[PDB]
Every structure is written in structure tokens, then in C-alpha cells.
Amino acid sequence: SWTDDLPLCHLSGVGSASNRSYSADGKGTESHPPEDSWLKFRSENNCFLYGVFNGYDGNRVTNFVAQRLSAELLLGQLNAEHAEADVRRVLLQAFDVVERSFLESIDDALAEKASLQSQLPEGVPQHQLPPQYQKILERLKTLEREISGGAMAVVAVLLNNKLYVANVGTNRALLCKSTVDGLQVTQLNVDHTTENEDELFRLSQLGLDAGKIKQVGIICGQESTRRIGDYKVKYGYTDIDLLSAAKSKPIIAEPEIHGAQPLDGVTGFLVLMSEGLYKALEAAHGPGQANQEIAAMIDTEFAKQTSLDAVAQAVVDRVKRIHSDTFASGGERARFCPRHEDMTLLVRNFGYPLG
């Protein structure tokens, strides 16, 4: 938590809300601990770092990634006078170090887990286990919490008024430019899913059947084809149907880095958002319009709110209302909105007027 001493960026805002499942009858929701996270830091120079992270299976990986990525980038590694090629290399190394050091951090616990499993009669219902093996089982559950979890991440670095985006997974970055002819919205990164052809290709080159992968859509509760952490899929993919044939890790942690974006004389804002936010909007309004809608909602709030945090939080709140109303209306799409995931929205302003 040395990051709590880091200068926060005054040109950005974050809005968020936790996952929720609606109760069948009546009003009342249930939530599991939130697993999203973010960061908005300004370094020495006119150097800025922003990120939105989406975890699953706990939030230990989400926090490990946020903390370590900060350590690998805001402690000197990023320099104003660096060439684009340098910045690409620095981001690439930061993610590689974050992934390798995370896996090294759980190694011992993985070994202890294996040893405890060897002492435990396999396949026996918890209640039928005598007291002796009960204690071991509990220790196994404690180790499981300590080593499990995964995370997707989209990061954006603003260096000498040039913008870079590093992305692993399905979070999104949008650059919204106010042109003479409306608000121009462009998604800077690309979603790493079984619908991303280049990823179906990468998975094809490893020996997996792209057709079956594409059909199924999800690889272990997650549709993201790139993730950080997640030992289940990084080590035991050999034993996972769709992945069985893989010659090397199907799910990787390498980021896709997107070309420098000049921002000189650009007026608008940058949006980083988690999968939970846009997926919820699409569950309620239908396939493919989340980007335009979210950017339009943010546009509207820019004129009414008095801080970027309020701008971001208002949009997150509107999406939550749209979503619960749809489920409550019992209407046509109610079947798609019984619950929603964590939502995070970060907005970094580039001269757009507020209030």
C-alpha cells in the first residue's frame, strides 16, 4: 500500500458499484465481495497512469496486479523523454514481471496443497469425513483462497501528451473526441474473447479446435482469452477439455499494446471500464451498443455534474437502474438481467467542459 502516498490525478474520476443478484420475489439483492479495482496516478513529469481491473475467484489477484504494476511503472521505469518503442517495451516488461511474480508468490502454497491432498481420502462427502481429516480439509480451503483468483486489466499511460493502452482481457478503453460533427467514439483496445478472430487464430496455432472453442464461447466461467493469474488455467489446462490439445498455454497474460495516440489539441475524454458495466447495459438494451450509449450517458453527465467522480458515478448509477428496472418490468429482456457484475468506470478528461 505504498501507493497511498502516490499523487492522485486531478483530471480524472472513478465511479463504481458492486455485483448484485436480484431476489426472485420482492426487492432485495445479494452481493459477493467486489473484485474490481482501478488506479489513477500522476508521476513526476507529465506522466499519468490509469487502470481498471476485473478479477474473478476472489480479489487477491486484482490487488496484487494493481500494486505490482504500480511498482513496475511509477518508480522510474517510465520516462517523459522515452521513444514509443521504449514505452511499449516498458509496459510489456511490467506485465511479464507481474505475471511471473504472481505465479512465484503462490508456489509454496501449491506444494503444501499437493501434500495435504495426498493425506486426504479423495471423493468423500465432507460430512462423512472423520474429525481427523476434517482439520486437513479446512487447511485446504484456506490455501485455496490464498492461491486462487484471476484478473483482466486495461491500462493507459499518458506520457508527454501521447496515450498508450495496454490490455489483457475484456475491459475497454474508449477515446471520445468532440468533433464539429458530434462526439466521435472509438474503442482503443480489442476484446480478447473467442469471438476475436486473431485470438481464435492464436489458439488455432496451439493445436486447439477453434470451431469448438468459438461455439462454446467460455473457457471456465470466463470468456476472456487473456488473463493474469488463474493457476487453474495456467497450470492444469492439459486437463481441461477445450484446452486438452494445447501445445502451450491457451490463456496467456501478455498484453496487446496499442500504438501511441497523439492528444495535442484533442478535446474530449478517455473512458476505461470493466466488463461488468458494459455487459449489464447490453443485457438490458441488447447486442452491441454499450460503447455509444455509455459515451452518450457520460456526455450528458458532463453538463450536469460538478466533479469527474460524480460524472462517472452517475453513469454507473443510471446503468444499474436501467438494469434492475428491466428485470423488474418482467418485460422482454428481463430474462437477461437477473444479476449483474461489478462495475467500474474511470473517466480522464481532456479539456471537455464540466458543469
- What is the binding site for Mn ion (CB under 5 A)? 35, 54, 56
- Cα separation, 319 vs 342, in Å, equals 12
Buried b / exposed e over 323-353, threshold 16 CB at 10 Å, is bbebbeeeeeebeebeebbbbbbbbbbbebe
Kindly state the smallest distance separating residue 283's Cβ from Mn ion, in Å.
15
Kindly state the smallest distance separating residue 342's Cβ from Mn ion, in Å.
5
- Cα separation, 178 vs 185, in Å, equals 9
Choice between 163 and 294, CB closer to Mn ion? 294
Choice between 39 and 158, CB closer to Mn ion? 39
Torsion of CA 111, 116, 122, 127, to 10 degrees: -140
Kindly state the smallest distance separating residue 200's Cβ from Mn ion, in Å.
23
Choice between 150 and 268, CB closer to Mn ion? 150
At residue 42's C-alpha, the angle toward residues 37 and 48, to 5°, is: 80
Cell readout for 87 is: 514505452
- Grid coordinates 477439455 are at which residue? 241
Choice between 170 and 313, CB closer to Mn ion? 170
Kindly state the smallest distance separating residue 164's Cβ from Mn ion, in Å.
24
Choice between 113 and 226, CB closer to Mn ion? 226
Kindly state the smallest distance separating residue 20's Cβ from Mn ion, in Å.
13
- Cα separation, 48 vs 163, in Å, equals 9
Kindly state the smallest distance separating residue 276's Cβ from Mn ion, in Å.
6
Choice between 56 and 95, CB closer to Mn ion? 56
Residues after which the chain has a gap (C–N > 2.5 Å): none
